[PDB]
Ligand binder design. Sequence first.
Ligand code: HEM
Ligand code: CA
Ligand code: CA
Ligand code: MG
Length: 306
Amino acid sequence: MQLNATFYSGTCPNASAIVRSTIQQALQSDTRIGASLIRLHFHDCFVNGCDASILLDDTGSIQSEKNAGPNVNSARGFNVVDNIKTALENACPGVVSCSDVLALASEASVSLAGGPSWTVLLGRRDSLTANLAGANSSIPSPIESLSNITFKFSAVGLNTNDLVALSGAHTFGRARCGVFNNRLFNFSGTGNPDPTLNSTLLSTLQQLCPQNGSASTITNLDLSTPDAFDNNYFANLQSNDGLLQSDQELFSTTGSSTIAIVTSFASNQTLFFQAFAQSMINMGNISPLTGSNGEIRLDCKKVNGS
Ligand code: HEM
Ligand SMILES: [Ca+2]
Ligand SMILES: [Ca+2]
Ligand SMILES: [Mg+2]
């Protein structure tokens, strides 16, 4: 079956408002939570489709994706997903899937932060299983080459236009020293820092992230506007201020089609927002469970009846 915008119209007509209100409240005590929630939809959709597989906790039969590399000591906001789900169950018992919660939460989080709105497609059902191993092989790493990140997007059905647009989600949220410290001292065995990192930002990060220091310390992905959803992410790349290798590679890779897409988005926020919305719908359409497949989870952490 197809996902559609009006799936909950007759059963939980206020779902969008409930999700948005809940995240607005969460934002008052955690300005990062919107960023964290949209990343959960990304890590969901990239493994066994947008099926809420990532939300399942370990059991005797389930090996949770929360311990997959990209998620461990990194993914967050699971409690807030639970609170969104509780609010929906209070209003609309048994109706909204956890998979749809993550799609709805992504749009709310982006719009609340000053980003675009878009028409969320709905009707996804929740998996009965998790895929930790697939998370380890399917989700791109910040130190991968542009060609290998591109390959991982293509394997789930997103193209280069989608990659550059969706990378703009790094306009908000945080990253730890450990996922960019290879840039700072001895980049790829060369004995020198990554030359595509601005020397000013370099010295700031060397002090934040000393060689013998903690890899868990965080900074902002977007030093311009850390919590605001805007095109500043792309402007940063133009001044060698992207934080991850995978960020800066979009602009600094010689002869890459991605350079012009970066400059389009830096030059025109409307074009960025239009592309971002379309690419989020594209990502949200990856391998949904529909009809009899999957279930509607009561509690996003566990399968029904368990
Ligand atoms: C293009 C390939 C991508 C790579 C290599 C990548 C990598 C990462 C890494 C390494 C972090 C830092 C994790 C931390 O240290 O705890 C991060 C954070 C984040 N990513 Fe990405 N990412 C990618 C694409 C995306 C996409 C497609 C989205 C959503 C549309 C997304 C949304 C975010 C957000 C919002 C955060 C901040 C999360 C938070 O503060 O809790 N990323 N990403
Ligand atoms: Ca999934
Ligand atoms: Ca920003
Ligand atoms: Mg600038």
